[PDB]
Design an enzyme around this catalytic site. Structure first.
Site, mmCIF file in Angstrom:
data_model
loop_
_atom_site.group_PDB
_atom_site.id
_atom_site.type_symbol
_atom_site.label_atom_id
_atom_site.label_comp_id
_atom_site.label_asym_id
_atom_site.label_seq_id
_atom_site.Cartn_x
_atom_site.Cartn_y
_atom_site.Cartn_z
ATOM 1 N N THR A 1 -16.582 14.776 -22.513
ATOM 2 C CA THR A 1 -15.453 13.991 -21.979
ATOM 3 C C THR A 1 -14.467 13.606 -23.095
ATOM 4 O O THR A 1 -13.250 13.512 -22.874
ATOM 5 C CB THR A 1 -15.992 12.780 -21.228
ATOM 6 O OG1 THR A 1 -16.857 12.088 -22.140
ATOM 7 C CG2 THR A 1 -16.786 13.168 -19.980
ATOM 8 N N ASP B 1 -27.311 9.077 -8.967
ATOM 9 C CA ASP B 1 -26.706 9.294 -10.270
ATOM 10 C C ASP B 1 -25.220 9.508 -10.144
ATOM 11 O O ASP B 1 -24.631 10.191 -10.984
ATOM 12 C CB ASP B 1 -27.401 10.430 -11.015
ATOM 13 C CG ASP B 1 -28.865 10.150 -11.285
ATOM 14 O OD1 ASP B 1 -29.153 9.030 -11.739
ATOM 15 O OD2 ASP B 1 -29.674 11.034 -10.988
ATOM 16 N N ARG C 1 -26.504 2.864 -29.191
ATOM 17 C CA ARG C 1 -26.110 3.970 -28.339
ATOM 18 C C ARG C 1 -24.878 4.730 -28.862
ATOM 19 O O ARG C 1 -23.839 4.138 -29.136
ATOM 20 C CB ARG C 1 -25.824 3.418 -26.945
ATOM 21 C CG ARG C 1 -25.240 4.472 -26.020
ATOM 22 C CD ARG C 1 -25.170 4.009 -24.600
ATOM 23 N NE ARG C 1 -24.431 4.912 -23.703
ATOM 24 C CZ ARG C 1 -23.113 5.185 -23.717
ATOM 25 N NH1 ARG C 1 -22.222 4.522 -24.478
ATOM 26 N NH2 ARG C 1 -22.708 6.153 -22.930
ATOM 27 N N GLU D 1 -23.988 0.534 -11.636
ATOM 28 C CA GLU D 1 -23.070 1.657 -11.673
ATOM 29 C C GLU D 1 -23.337 2.618 -10.502
ATOM 30 O O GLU D 1 -22.388 3.141 -9.891
ATOM 31 C CB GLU D 1 -23.244 2.376 -13.006
ATOM 32 C CG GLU D 1 -22.277 3.530 -13.219
ATOM 33 C CD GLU D 1 -22.560 4.244 -14.511
ATOM 34 O OE1 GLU D 1 -23.587 3.943 -15.197
ATOM 35 O OE2 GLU D 1 -21.800 5.199 -14.759
ATOM 36 N N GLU E 1 -16.792 14.623 -13.331
ATOM 37 C CA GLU E 1 -17.175 14.936 -14.700
ATOM 38 C C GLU E 1 -18.265 16.007 -14.765
ATOM 39 O O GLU E 1 -18.521 16.586 -15.829
ATOM 40 C CB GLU E 1 -17.694 13.714 -15.457
ATOM 41 C CG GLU E 1 -16.643 12.648 -15.715
ATOM 42 C CD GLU E 1 -17.084 11.595 -16.701
ATOM 43 O OE1 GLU E 1 -18.369 11.462 -16.914
ATOM 44 O OE2 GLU E 1 -16.181 10.951 -17.277
ATOM 45 N N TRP F 1 -10.358 9.118 -24.367
ATOM 46 C CA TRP F 1 -11.227 8.934 -23.218
ATOM 47 C C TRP F 1 -11.896 7.553 -23.263
ATOM 48 O O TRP F 1 -11.957 6.850 -22.245
ATOM 49 C CB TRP F 1 -12.201 10.118 -23.122
ATOM 50 C CG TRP F 1 -13.065 9.937 -21.913
ATOM 51 C CD1 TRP F 1 -14.375 9.560 -21.871
ATOM 52 C CD2 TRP F 1 -12.579 9.874 -20.552
ATOM 53 N NE1 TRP F 1 -14.735 9.328 -20.554
ATOM 54 C CE2 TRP F 1 -13.644 9.480 -19.738
ATOM 55 C CE3 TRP F 1 -11.331 10.096 -19.961
ATOM 56 C CZ2 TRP F 1 -13.534 9.350 -18.369
ATOM 57 C CZ3 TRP F 1 -11.234 10.015 -18.599
ATOM 58 C CH2 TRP F 1 -12.294 9.606 -17.804
ATOM 59 N N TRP G 1 -10.389 4.702 -18.342
ATOM 60 C CA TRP G 1 -9.430 4.670 -17.234
ATOM 61 C C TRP G 1 -9.947 3.778 -16.124
ATOM 62 O O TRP G 1 -9.185 3.402 -15.241
ATOM 63 C CB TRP G 1 -9.189 6.091 -16.708
ATOM 64 C CG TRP G 1 -10.338 6.645 -15.895
ATOM 65 C CD1 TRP G 1 -11.645 6.720 -16.230
ATOM 66 C CD2 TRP G 1 -10.234 7.211 -14.560
ATOM 67 N NE1 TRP G 1 -12.396 7.289 -15.230
ATOM 68 C CE2 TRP G 1 -11.536 7.589 -14.179
ATOM 69 C CE3 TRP G 1 -9.169 7.417 -13.653
ATOM 70 C CZ2 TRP G 1 -11.820 8.185 -12.958
ATOM 71 C CZ3 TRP G 1 -9.464 7.985 -12.445
ATOM 72 C CH2 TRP G 1 -10.772 8.380 -12.093
ATOM 73 N N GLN H 1 -18.015 12.382 -8.159
ATOM 74 C CA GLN H 1 -17.180 11.286 -7.753
ATOM 75 C C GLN H 1 -15.894 11.875 -7.219
ATOM 76 O O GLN H 1 -15.624 13.068 -7.433
ATOM 77 C CB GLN H 1 -16.878 10.359 -8.934
ATOM 78 C CG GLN H 1 -16.075 11.019 -10.028
ATOM 79 C CD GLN H 1 -16.176 10.210 -11.300
ATOM 80 O OE1 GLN H 1 -17.107 10.386 -12.081
ATOM 81 N NE2 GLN H 1 -15.289 9.227 -11.466
HETATM 82 O O1 LIG Z 1 -17.575 9.459 -21.783
HETATM 83 C C1 LIG Z 1 -18.575 8.906 -20.941
HETATM 84 C C2 LIG Z 1 -18.494 9.359 -19.482
HETATM 85 O O2 LIG Z 1 -17.227 8.992 -18.904
HETATM 86 C C3 LIG Z 1 -19.542 8.660 -18.662
HETATM 87 O O3 LIG Z 1 -19.607 9.312 -17.380
HETATM 88 C C4 LIG Z 1 -20.911 8.609 -19.361
HETATM 89 N N1 LIG Z 1 -21.021 9.338 -20.621
HETATM 90 C C5 LIG Z 1 -22.259 9.186 -21.400
HETATM 91 C C6 LIG Z 1 -21.837 9.164 -22.863
HETATM 92 C C7 LIG Z 1 -20.345 8.774 -22.833
HETATM 93 O O4 LIG Z 1 -20.003 7.395 -22.865
HETATM 94 C C8 LIG Z 1 -19.868 9.423 -21.539
HETATM 95 O O1 LIG Z 2 -14.842 6.453 -16.451
HETATM 96 C C1 LIG Z 2 -16.057 6.631 -15.732
HETATM 97 C C2 LIG Z 2 -16.241 8.059 -15.202
HETATM 98 O O2 LIG Z 2 -15.159 8.276 -14.277
HETATM 99 C C3 LIG Z 2 -17.504 8.204 -14.419
HETATM 100 O O3 LIG Z 2 -17.929 9.587 -14.363
HETATM 101 C C4 LIG Z 2 -18.549 7.219 -14.975
HETATM 102 N N1 LIG Z 2 -18.393 6.807 -16.337
HETATM 103 C C5 LIG Z 2 -19.431 5.933 -16.943
HETATM 104 C C6 LIG Z 2 -18.710 5.005 -17.869
HETATM 105 C C7 LIG Z 2 -17.369 4.841 -17.150
HETATM 106 O O4 LIG Z 2 -17.433 3.948 -16.045
HETATM 107 C C8 LIG Z 2 -17.103 6.293 -16.776
#
Ligand SMILES: O[C@H]1[C@H](O)[C@@H](O)CN2CC[C@H](O)[C@H]12
Ligand SMILES: O[C@H]1[C@H](O)[C@@H](O)CN2CC[C@H](O)[C@H]12
Ligand SMILES: O[C@H]1[C@H](O)[C@@H](O)CN2CC[C@H](O)[C@H]12
Ligand SMILES: O[C@H]1[C@H](O)[C@@H](O)CN2CC[C@H](O)[C@H]12
EC number: 3.2.1.216
Lengths: 659, 659
Positions: A385, A551, A52, A594, A450, A369, A321, A517
Site C-alpha cells: 500500500t 477480515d 509494529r 475494525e 486492497e 498512504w 484517508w 471493501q
Molecule cells: O497500509 C496499511 C493498510 O491500509 C491496512 O489495510 C493494513 N496494513 C497492514 C500494514 C500496514 O499498516 C497496512
Molecule cells: O485505510 C484503511 C484501508 O482502506 C483498509 O483496507 C483498512 N486499513 C487498516 C488501517 C486503515 O483503517 C486502513
C-alpha cells in the site's frame, strides 16, 4: 444499560473486557477493569520507532492516574469489593467507577481528559464512610517499558497559602526522538495546615510514588483529586518545566473551575447532535460514535485522527484517508472547525508530499498512504500500500475542496486549499499515461479494494484523480487564476470501464473476485461520478455480496446503507446500517472493532462511515457541488419514529425527519 | 572511437584510466576499469566533515553495483576474459561493459542512474553461453571507510506472486550528521517458483553480500537485473525504510517500465542539442559536454552542481559561482527549467546569505564563496577566497536577472528574483566606500584572478557590483516598487580604471603580473560593460598571454574564444576553443580536468564555459538586455561546415549557421 447519554457496565469481567476511552484530542485514557487503574494512556503527536511495522508509532505513555487505596492497611482489589460498576458519561467524557468496600465505605472515582487543557488530566475520588476508617492513598508513576532513561523527581511548591507536592517523571521514547514529562499533584479541600503530609518513595528503577494517610470518621465524605500534566518535546521545547508549570496552574485553578470549563467545552460540542426516537439502542450507539469522534479530534489544531483515534496504538497512530473520506465528512457538517484541523494536518505536510512525489518520479504533491509527524511515508515496507495505493492524494484534494464548499471561506481557499489542490492536480497530471486511443490510464496501483495489488485503472483511484483535477480547476476559477487546460482534458478521458453486464469494473483484471471493501460503489458515494439510479443499483447488486464476512474492515456497509437510503429503500438501508457496526462490537461498552468479530477497538473510521449513513443517508444531507449543504430524498428505518440532526452547516440548521 | 553519441574504450588500461560518470542529478556512478565493478558513488545533498579543507564535503558512498561473477566456480578476472570493451551511451546515460569469458560465454552489463527516480540505480546483466554452464553471482555491499556504525541486513518481501530479497545497509557519515541507507534486490524474468534461491553472507565487519547460482543451457541467454536505492537523512526523515520501500517499488515496476521512463526523460533532455558537420571530434566532444551538464543537474529541484558535478568529491561538492556564470548560461538557453533549479538553490539559501552579511558587517545578502547544505560559508579557512572573494554575490544577482530576461516570468520575479536582487543590491550599497572625488570603491578583496589577494577595485568584482545594482533597479521598475535611488547613483560611479596603454586595469596594484584566469576580459563577456570592439581587442591583446600554461583552471580560453567569435576572427576563435579543453583531457573517454595536463576530472565548469563559446560565440546567441534571446554576428571554425543549435529559449528555436 441503554441510557442515551451513558454507557454502563456492572462487575467488569477482566476475561472479557474492552476498555472505553476518554480523550480531549491530545490525551487518551483507556479504562482498566481494575478499580482506580487505567489500562493505557496515549499522547497525540508523539511518534518513534516502536514495535509494529518498523516505522514510527504512538508510544504507550505513563499511566499517570494509577492509584492504590487501602482501608486500615487492607489494599482494595477486585476480589474484596462489591457492587462494582463503571460508567462513561458521554455528555462530558467522565469515566466513573463506584464500589463498596466491606462494611467501611463507598468509593466513587471519576476521571477526565480536560477539554480546555489539552495536556491535563484529573481524577476526583470521593469516599463515603459507614464506619470509622483510615485510608492510605498512593499515586504511582511507573515508567512504561516503552520509555527509557527515566528520572523520578518530587518537590514541594510552597508559599504562605499552598503546599503543592509535585510527583514528576521525565523519560525518552525508544530512539531518543522525544522527551516526555509527566507531573502530578493531589488537591485537597481542607487547606495547607490541615492537608495530609505527602510522602515520596523511590523504591524501584521504573517506579516512584507519592502517598498519604487520612483518618475519616463514620458518616463523612472525604474527597481528593489527582491532577496530572503530560507533555513532550514534540509539543514544547522544555517539557520538564512546562509539565510542572501546568500542574501548578491547574492545582491553583482547582477542581470546580477545571470541571466548569471542561463542561462548557463539552456542552458546545453537543450543540451538534443526532436524536432518534423509537430506538434507544440506535440512539445510544450513535451518541457513542459522535462521542468518539469528538473525543479523538480537536478544533484549532493541526491534529488528525488515526483509524483508532486515541483509543490505543492501532495502526501506529498513523493518519490515512480514513480521515479525509470517513471521519472528516460528518465532522465537516457538524463542527467545521474540527474538519479544519484535519485538513490543516495535510496543509502543514504539503512539503513532505512534494518530497515524496519527487522521490517516486512525479510532479506536485503525492500524499503518503500513512502519515505521522513529518508528513513523509510511514507505511510498513512489507505492505505494498505504501508504495502503490495512490488514491490518498485525491482523497486529500476532495476533502480540501469540500472544506471550501461547506464554509465558503475564500481566504482559506487562497492560502491553503489552492496550494493543496494545485499540487495534487500536478501529481495526477504527471501520474496518468495517455494511450493510443487518447484515453488516460493510471497503471500499477493497489486498489481501494486492497486485495487487488499491482493492477491497472482501479475505479476508485481513477475516480479520485478525476475529482482532484476537476476541483483544482474549479478552485482556480474561484480565485481568478488560469488552470492548466490539461487538467480538464485529462479528467474527461480518465478511463472508467464497465463489464459486459453493465457493472462498473473495479480494475482491468477484475471479473468476479471477492473484494476487501467498497471500491466501485464509492463512485456513487462519496464521489458522485455515478448518479444514474439504475447504474447505482447494478453496481450494488453485483458487488454487495463480494465482501466476505471475515477480515473485512468497517468501510463498506455504511456506504451500502447510504446508497440504499438515497434509493429510498428503507429495509435494505437499515439492514446495512446494522451490519456496518453491530457485528464488530466488543463488551461491555459496545466499542467498535475494525472487522466483524474483531478484538481491536476503537475503530473510529467505522464510526465515521456509520455517521455518514445516518446524516447523509437517513438524513438525506449532502454537500452541494455549488456550495453549502442541501437535502435530497431519503428514508428512515421502519422502527425510527423521528430523526433530528442539529448544528448542520455554517448556518447551524436543524433537520427533522419522520415517516 | 568517434561515434557522435557514444564514448568507447577497448581493453581498459587500469594504469592509465579515468572513469566516466552516469548520473541523474542526484546519484553519480563513476566507472571502474574492472568488469562488473564501479569506482565511486556520490550522492548529492549529503555533506559532512571529511578529509580536505576541514569543512563539509561530499562523502564516498556505497559502491552498490559491485558484483562478482563465476562460471563453474571460476571467478571472472583480467586474465580469463577477452574482447573486453566499455561504452558510454550519451543518449541515455547507459554505461555498458562486454566481454567473453574464455570460449564459453559472452557477458554484457549496462547500468543506469535512473533518470525519473533520483535515488534508484539499475544494472542489467546478460549472459549467453556456448555450452551448458553454471554461474554464481554475488552482489556485495561494502561499507566505505568514510562511513561508520554500519548495520547489515537481509530479508524477504513476499506475497503469493513475488519474493523480493532485500540486501540493505545503514550507516553514518563521519560526525553522525547524516544517516545513509542502501537497499538492493535482484530482478528475474522466470517468476517466483523458478527464480534462484538467494543466500546471504555477513562475513566481515564492513561487508555483506547476497548470492545465487543458476544453471544456463547451451545456446541460451540468461538475464537478471540488480536494482538499488541510495538515500540519506538529508533527503528523507526515515532513509532506512524509504530505501527498502523504493527498491520494492522499483522491483514491482520492473526493468521494462523503469527503462521506458528513463528513456523518455533522456529523450526530452536531448530535444536541446548541438550538431556540428565537418568535425566528428568536435561533435563528440560537445555532446560529451552537454551530456555531463545534463547528468549533473536536475529540473524541478533546488540542486546546484559543484565544479565536478557528480563525478567525484572534487572541491568537496561545494557550489561556487561556477554555477551562476559558467554552467548556468548554457542551461538557461537550452533548458530553462534546469537553470531554474540552479537559482532555486540560491533562493532557498537567502537567509544564510543574510546571516553571512550580518556577521561580516554588511547589509542585505552576502552569498558565500563556497556553498553546501545550509547556504553558510563553507570555504576552507586557509583559503582567503572565503572571507574576501566577494563577486559571488553579484554573480547570483546576474543569474537571477538573466533567468527573468530569458523566461519573462514576472511571477517568479516577484516571488524569488526580486528577494535576491533586492538583498544583494543592499549588500553592494553597504560594501562600497565613497572617496573624496565622489567615486565608489570596493577595497580589500580577492580578485576573480584569485592570485591577486587583498587588493582594491578589482575589474570583475566592481563590474558585478555595477550590474547587481542596475539589475535590482530595473527589477524594481518591472514590479512597480520604488528602488533606493542610491543604487543607480552608486552603479554609475563604481571605479573601473585603465592603464596608460588604455587597457582595463585588473586591480589598483596591477601592472603586468601573470593572472590565474580571465578577469578584466569578463567585463566584455559575460558582463557586457565593455562593448567597444577596439577596447575588447586591446584587453585581449594585453591579458591573453598573462595566463600561464600550468595550474590555471579552464575558466579563461572559452571566454577568449567567444570574444574572438564576436570580433569575427575565426582562426583565433577556433584556436582558443581547442585550447580551452583539449590540453585538459584524460583517457580513455576524453573527460576534462580542471587544468592543462591535470588529473582531476570531470570539471563541469570548464564544459559550461566551452558550451558558451559554442552557443554564444560560434552560434552568436545572446541574452538580450531587454528580454529574450537574440543573435549577434559570429564566425565558425574553418573546418565546420554547419552548426545547428536546437531548443533555444522559451520559443524552442533552432539556429543554423554556415560559412
Ligand atoms: O497500509 C496499511 C493498510 O491500509 C491496512 O489495510 C493494513 N496494513 C497492514 C500494514 C500496514 O499498516 C497496512
Ligand atoms: O485505510 C484503511 C484501508 O482502506 C483498509 O483496507 C483498512 N486499513 C487498516 C488501517 C486503515 O483503517 C486502513
Ligand atoms: O570558482 C573557481 C575559481 O574561479 C578558480 O580560481 C578555480 N576554483 C577551483 C574550484 C572552483 O572551480 C574555483
Ligand atoms: O575557494 C577555493 C578557490 O576558489 C579554488 O581556486 C581552490 N581553493 C583551495 C581551497 C578552497 O576550496 C579554495
Amino acid at each position: 444499560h441503554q441510557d442515551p447519554w451513558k454507557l454502563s457496565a456492572d462487575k467488569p469481567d477482566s476475561n472479557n473486557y474492552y476498555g472505553e476511552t476518554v480523550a480531549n484530542g491530545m490525551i487518551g485514557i483507556i479504562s482498566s477493569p481494575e478499580p482506580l487503574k487505567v489500562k493505557e494512556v496515549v499522547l497525540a503527536g508523539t511518534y518513534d520507532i516502536y514495535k509494529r511495522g518498523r516505522v514510527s508509532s504512538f508510544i504507550p505513555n505513563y499511566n499517570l492516574l494509577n492509584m492504590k487505596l487501602a482501608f486500615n492497611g487492607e489494599s482494595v482489589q477486585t476480589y474484596n469489593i462489591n457492587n462494582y460498576k463503571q460508567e462513561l458519561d458521554m455528555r462530558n467524557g467522565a469515566f466513573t467507577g463506584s464500589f463498596q468496600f466491606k462494611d467501611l465505605a463507598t468509593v466513587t472515582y471519576s476521571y477526565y481528559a480536560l477539554r480546555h487543557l489539552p495536556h491535563c488530566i484529573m481524577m476526583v475520588v470521593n469516599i463515603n464512610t459507614q464506619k470509622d476508617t483510615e485510608i492510605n492513598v498512593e499515586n504511582l508513576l511507573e515508567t512504561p517499558s516503552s520509555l527509557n532513561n527515566q528520572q523520578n523527581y518530587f518537590q514541594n511548591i510552597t508559599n504562605t497559602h499552598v503546599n503543592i507536592p509535585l510527583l514528576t517523571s521525565v523519560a525518552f521514547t525508544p530512539t531518543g526522538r522525544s522527551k516526555i514529562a509527566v507531573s502530578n499533584t493531589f488537591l485537597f479541600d481542607e487547606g495547607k495546615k490541615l492537608q495530609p503530609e505527602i510522602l515520596h518513595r523511590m523504591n524501584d528503577a521504573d517506579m516512584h510514588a507519592m502517598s498519604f494517610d487520612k483518618k475519616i470518621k463514620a458518616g463523612k465524605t472525604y474527597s481528593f483529586a489527582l491532577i496530572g500534566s503530560l507533555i513532550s518535546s514534540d509539543h514544547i521545547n522544555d517539557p520538564y518545566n512546562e509539565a510542572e508549570r501546568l500542574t501548578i496552574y491547574a492545582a491553583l485553578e482547582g477542581k470546580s473551575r477545571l470541571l466548569n470549563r471542561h463542561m462548557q467545552e463539552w456542552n458546545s460540542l453537543w450543540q451538534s447532535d443526532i436524536q432518534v426516537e423509537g430506538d434507544p439502542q440506535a440512539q445510544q450507539d450513535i451518541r457513542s460514535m459522535l462521542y468518539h469522534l469528538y473525543s479523538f479530534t480537536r478544533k484549532s489544531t493541526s491534529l488528525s485522527p488515526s483509524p483508532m483515534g486515541l483509543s490505543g496504538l492501532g495502526y501506529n497512530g498513523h493518519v490515512f484517508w480514513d480521515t479525509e473520506i470517513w471521519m472528516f465528512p460528518p465532522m465537516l457538517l457538524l463542527h467545521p472547525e474540527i474538519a479544519k484541523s484535519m485538513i490543516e494536518y495535510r496543509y502543514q505536510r504539503l512539503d513532505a508530499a512534494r518530497k515524496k512525489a519527487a522521490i517516486y518520479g512525479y510532479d506536485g504533491a503525492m500524499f503518503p498512504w500513512e502519515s505521522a509527524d513529518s508528513g513523509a511515508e510511514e507505511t510498513p515496507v512489507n505492505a505494498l500500500t505504501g508504495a502503490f495505493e495512490h488514491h490518498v492524494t485525491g482523497d486529500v484534494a476532495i476533502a480540501a475542496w469540500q472544506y471550501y464548499l461547506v464554509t465558503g471561506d475564500k481566504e482559506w481557499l487562497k492560502e491553503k486549499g489552492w496550494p493543496i489542490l494545485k499540487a495534487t492536480a500536478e501529481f495526477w497530471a504527471s501520474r496518468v499515461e495517455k494511450n493510443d486511443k487518447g484515453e488516460y490510464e493510471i497503471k500499477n496501483v493497489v486498489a481501494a479494494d486492497e486485495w487487488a495489488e499491482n493492477i491497472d485503472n482501479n475505479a476508485y483511484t481513477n475516480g479520485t484523480a478525476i475529482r482532484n483535477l476537476q476541483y483544482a480547476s474549479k478552485c482556480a476559477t474561484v480565485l481568478g487564476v488560469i488552470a492548466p487546460k490539461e487538467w480538464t482534458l485529462i479528467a474527461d478521458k480518465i478511463l472508467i470501464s464497465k463489464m459486459s453486464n453493465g457493472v462498473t469494473r473495479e480494475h482491468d483484471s477484475y471479473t468476479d473476485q471477492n473484494i476487501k471493501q467498497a471500491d466501485a460503489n464509492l463512485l456513487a458515494y462519496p464521489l458522485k461520478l455515478i448518479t444514474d439510479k439504475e447504474q447505482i443499483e447494478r453496481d450494488l447488486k453485483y458487488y454487495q455480496t463480494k465482501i466476505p464476512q471475515s477480515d473485512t474492515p468497517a468501510m463498506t456497509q455504511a456506504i451500502f446503507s447510504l446508497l440504499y437510503s438515497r434509493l429510498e429503500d428503507s429495509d435494505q438501508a437499515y439492514h446495512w446500517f446494522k451490519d456496518a457496526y453491530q457485528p464488530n462490537l466488543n463488551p461491555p461498552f459496545r466499542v467498535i472493532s475494525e472487522c466483524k468479530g474483531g478484538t481491536n477497538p476503537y475503530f473510529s473510521t467505522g464510526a465515521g462511515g456509520v455517521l455518514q449513513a445516518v446524516i447523509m443517508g437517513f438524513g438525506g444531507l449532502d454537500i452541494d457541488a455549488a456550495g453549502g449543504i442541501k437535502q435530497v430524498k431519503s428514508v428512515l428505518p421502519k422502527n425510527w419514529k423521528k430523526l433530528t440532526i442539529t448544528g448542520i452547516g455554517i448556518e447551524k440548521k436543524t433537520f427533522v425527519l419522520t415517516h
